[PDB]
Design a protein around this ligand. Structure first.
Ligand SMILES: *[C@@H]1O[C@H](CO)[C@@H](O)[C@H](O)[C@H]1NC(C)=O
Ligand SMILES: *[C@@H]1O[C@H](CO)[C@@H](O)[C@H](O)[C@H]1NC(C)=O
Ligand SMILES: *[C@@H]1O[C@H](CO)[C@@H](O)[C@H](O)[C@H]1NC(C)=O
Ligand SMILES: *[C@@H]1O[C@H](CO)[C@@H](O)[C@H](O)[C@H]1NC(C)=O
Ligand SMILES: *[C@@H]1O[C@H](CO)[C@@H](O)[C@H](O)[C@H]1NC(C)=O
Ligand SMILES: *[C@@H]1O[C@H](CO)[C@@H](O)[C@H](O)[C@H]1NC(C)=O
Ligand SMILES: *[C@@H]1O[C@H](CO)[C@@H](O)[C@H](O)[C@H]1NC(C)=O
Ligand SMILES: *[C@@H]1O[C@H](CO)[C@@H](O)[C@H](O)[C@H]1NC(C)=O
Ligand SMILES: *[C@@H]1O[C@H](CO)[C@@H](O)[C@H](O)[C@H]1NC(C)=O
Ligand SMILES: *[C@@H]1O[C@H](CO)[C@@H](O)[C@H](O)[C@H]1NC(C)=O
Ligand SMILES: *[C@@H]1O[C@H](CO)[C@@H](O)[C@H](O)[C@H]1NC(C)=O
Lengths: 240, 246, 96, 49, 49, 49
């Protein structure tokens, strides 16, 4: 629905792309729009669970060809459900895929949580009459693997012509070695910030009477060769 | 006595500890057991750390697999180019390999430097949680675990620390009828620290995180003003301990 | 524009983040500070403002004995913040 | 472009990691609660509008 | 040239994504502390008490 | 050099953004107060020096 000036041949956009043309044979204004490309995503549960597979066609809809359209795009192999579950595998735009129940892949709308209506009044207060000691786990990374790459060994493996042609490029090799050395020094500054808070090393008395609390799982048992605790010994065997 | 102070730190009277000490000990020990079983059952609970290990190893595998690229040269192997060509003719292919491998190293160092900034941000957060959740008691809400923080426990981990946050979750609620004041003899009575509740007949005062009733006396409360400004002031007799004494 | 550069949608739509902030406001109004630490515990809102005045050292008689003036200052401040977001888009440049 | 190895795969890894982190950002900010609440229709909030 | 252009775009997107992550950790902390609780930290949740 | 596109303006954009951020840093740290205060010349500070 554009309208050229009476001499103009084609059109451009902000991105310097040809967005419109005029037909050379007959005076009419066409409109170039590129062909419907887009990414292909493969939604899967584990191969250690199943081999049923859905396929996402991003940004385009089901022109090509359990074939349903999302805002993320066309979605083949999935089964739309009018229920709403906790999100398992995200797709986009509030739609999550999951391998539920014979068991096939469903694709639904994400449930944000259990709906609740808290009572409110001018006179109503809810006082708790009991409690519960909850013990929770947070896992934070402190340091990263130290690494130095000898750039001359990497670029030129046992060569002297290559070493000289590398010497022509100035000081890139020392710059990269210096940046990785700065990283590897930061990775020890991190563990000295986190753990080394306290200068005196304290140790627990042998008569453990703590009012009834059992601290055996977390205190180190010195019968082990490595003097660390049960929960630490479980944690050192779940990261490979 | 540490947990008496740590219940005082979350607005709970410390009689609640000593009069429930065995039950709190059993709940703490059972929650430690639940953590031990929840870690010995599922092997993917430490995913924060495995993401670091896997992403750093993928970066190193990418850096290795860039060695088998030709980059416009005749071969990826330098010794083939050295053995098959003139000393003027080989330097063009050697320049192409040097340019590509140096681009690979600059990409790896830039990527590691950004990733190092992210690890440092989480290490500063972990040092803050060691200094504040573990080494003291934090009033910061849902910083030391969901609930009211009582104490926190450090445990080591591969390239990381693991905090065990012992918190306080109030369990059994119960609807009560409340009122912002008491009108006694034309005076207003506000609670000192607590809230007025009534089971239906008699008005009590209790602290807000546990239901322990107190008969409203002149030392639970606080006289200020008159019975005509506060919106919702109700009528009950405030007990006076000097009256069965004189 | 369309030279391979595909913009992906977010996971949480704007309706979902609006329902989340709805839940947060209904929690802070009907319960207060208690719904982030377990279950939601109903509290009449004048008692939330009294027990938030105790949290800053002001005695809670100041709230109950000035409840209408505090209500009027709060509502007038909400009106002023609506004016500053309706006639001016200067602070929103942080997003722009 | 095939003769440059795997630059394209690495750039797509980077941009995918960014996209997953943007969803983590919005869910860490907003999804603080797990029970969605609703105000009662009678709004007797002490006089606050 | 085009590969250097695309890699420069990717590098600046990683840096800006890190900046956005820092501000979203501020935003998650301010929901956890200003909204869900009543903060004692000075000038963290506005100017005043 | 003009055949290499918009590299140079992008580099100047990056450095100018850094400089503007540096003035934002040193303003947001120090300029916490909008009235310059002074101590009185009679210094009776309870004994502290
Ligand atoms: C993976 O599958 C095998 C057999 O297909 C099964 O024995 C194993 O338990 C599965 N892995 C897990 C973690 O369950
Ligand atoms: C694709 O989407 C457009 C616009 O929503 C619609 O007109 C068209 O029918 C869709 N194509 C198919 C095959 O559904
Ligand atoms: C879900 O409900 C809508 C409206 O009732 C209906 O059109 C649709 O077919 C339903 N989906 C399935 C899978 O039955
Ligand atoms: C509190 O709950 C525990 C179980 O967690 C129970 O054994 C105890 O009797 C309860 N206390 C009261 C006062 O109801
Ligand atoms: C503490 O709990 C552990 C759990 O294995 C048990 O083996 C140990 O005997 C207990 N010790 C005490 C003092 O209760
Ligand atoms: C309190 O009252 C509300 C509304 O009547 C009700 O939904 C809730 O179950 C009650 N709780 C208790 C503990 O009585
Ligand atoms: C409330 O507690 C008082 C304690 O003095 C008791 O006498 C009264 O019967 C109780 N009323 C109800 C409804 O439980
Ligand atoms: C209780 O509700 C009534 C209307 O049902 C209202 O007039 C009164 O003001 C409320 N109580 C208080 C203390 O505001
Ligand atoms: C409360 O008592 C006063 C006198 O002490 C009386 O004037 C007032 O009407 C009473 N309140 C109600 C609601 O009847
Ligand atoms: C609250 O404010 C809105 C607009 O500012 C107004 O329409 C409404 O009537 C007000 N409610 C009360 C109870 O004043
Ligand atoms: C404070 O200390 C300085 C140097 O120690 C000294 O010159 C000065 O007299 C002291 N102030 C007073 C009030 O003594």
């Amino acid at each position: 629905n554009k309208k050229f000036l009476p001499f103009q041949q084609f059109g451009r956009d902000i991105a310097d792309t040809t967005d419109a043309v005029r037909d050379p044979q007959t005076l009419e204004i066409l409109d170039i729009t590129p062909c419907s490309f887009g990414g292909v995503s493969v939604i899967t549960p584990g191969t250690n669970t199943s081999n049923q597979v859905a396929v996402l066609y991003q940004d385009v809809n089901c022109t090509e060809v359990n074939v349903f359209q999302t805002r993320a795009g066309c979605l083949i192999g999935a089964e739309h459900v009018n229920n709403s579950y906790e999100c398992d595998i995200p797709i986009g735009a509030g739609i999550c895929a999951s391998y539920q129940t014979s068991q096939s892949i469903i694709a639904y709308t994400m449930s944000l949580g259990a709906e609740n209506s808290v009572a409110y009044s001018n006179n109503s207060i809810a006082i708790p009459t009991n409690f519960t000691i909850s013990v929770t786990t947070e896992i934070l990374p402190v340091s990263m693997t130290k690494t130095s790459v000898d750039c001359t060994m990497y670029i030129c493996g046992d060569s002297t012509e290559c070493s000289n042609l590398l010497l022509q490029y100035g000081s890139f090799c020392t710059q990269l070695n210096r940046a990785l050395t700065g990283i590897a020094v930061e990775q020890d500054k991190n563990t000295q910030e986190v753990f080394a808070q306290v200068k005196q090393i304290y140790k627990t008395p042998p008569i453990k009477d703590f009012g009834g609390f059992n601290f055996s799982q977390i205190l180190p048992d010195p019968s082990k060769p490595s003097k660390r605790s049960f929960i630490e010994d479980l944690l050192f065997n779940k990261v490979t | 006595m540490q947990m008496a102070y740590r219940f005082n730190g979350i607005g709970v009277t410390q009689n609640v500890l000593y009069e429930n000490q065995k039950l709190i000990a059993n709940q703490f020990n059972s929650a430690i057991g639940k953590i031990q079983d929840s870690l010995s059952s599922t092997a993917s609970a430490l995913g924060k750390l495995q993401d670091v290990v896997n992403q750093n190893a993928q970066a190193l595998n990418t850096l290795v697999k860039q060695l088998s690229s030709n980059f416009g040269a005749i071969s990826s192997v330098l010794n083939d180019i050295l053995s098959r060509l003139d000393k003027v003719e080989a330097e063009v292919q050697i320049d192409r390999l040097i340019t590509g491998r140096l681009q690979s190293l600059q990409t790896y160092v830039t990527q590691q430097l950004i990733r190092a900034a992210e690890i440092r941000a989480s290490a500063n957060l972990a040092a803050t949680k060691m200094s504040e959740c573990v080494l003291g008691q934090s009033k910061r809400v849902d910083f030391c675990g969901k609930g009211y923080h009582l104490m926190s426990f450090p445990q080591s981990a591969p390239h990381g620390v693991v905090f065990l946050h012992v918190t306080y979750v109030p369990a059994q609620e119960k609807n009560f009828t409340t009122a912002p004041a008491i009108c006694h003899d034309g005076k207003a009575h506000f609670p000192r620290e607590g809230v007025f509740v009534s089971n239906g007949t008699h008005w009590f005062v209790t602290q807000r995180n546990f239901y322990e009733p107190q008969i409203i006396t002149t030392d639970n409360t606080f006289v200020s003003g008159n019975c005509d400004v506060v919106i919702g002031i109700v009528n009950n007799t405030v007990y006076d301990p000097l009256q069965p004494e004189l | 524009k369309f030279n391979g550069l595909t913009v992906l949608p977010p996971l949480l739509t704007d309706e979902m983040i609006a329902q989340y902030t709805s839940a947060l406001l209904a929690g802070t109004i009907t319960s207060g500070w208690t719904f982030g630490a377990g279950a939601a515990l109903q509290i009449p809102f004048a008692m939330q403002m009294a027990y938030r005045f105790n949290g800053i050292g002001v005695t809670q008689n100041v709230l109950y004995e000035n409840q209408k003036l505090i209500a009027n200052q709060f509502n007038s401040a909400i009106g002023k913040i609506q004016d500053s977001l309706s006639s001016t888009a200067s602070a929103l440049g942080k997003l722009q």
